[PDB]
Amino acid sequence: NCVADYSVLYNSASFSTFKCYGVSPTKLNDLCFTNVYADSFVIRGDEVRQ
């Protein structure tokens, strides 16, 4: 029930890929999904691909 505001990832830098989307990426929008399972933690940082 939020504004979404897909103005990140393409923003700043670093980050990771997605590999889990549909078609026409951009700021996603259009389809606004159903849930946001926001998970937070800290990793060693070298793994990344793990």
Which positions touch other proteins (CB under 8 A)?
9-11, 13, 25-27
Neighbours of 28 (CB within 10 A): 15
Output 8 or 23, the one with its CB closest to ligand NAG. Answer: 8
CB 36 within 8 A of CB 28: no
Tell the smallest beta-carbon distance from residue 37 to other proteins (Å): 22
- Binding partner selected for residue 9 from other proteins, ligand NAG, none, CB under the kind-specific 5 to 8 Å limit: other proteins
Q: Strands, E, within 1-50: which ranges?
A: none
Select the residue interacting with ligand NAG from 1, 2, 11, 18 (CB under 6 A).
11
Which long-range CB contacts under 8 A does 33-38 form with residues at least 24 apart? Answer: 36/2
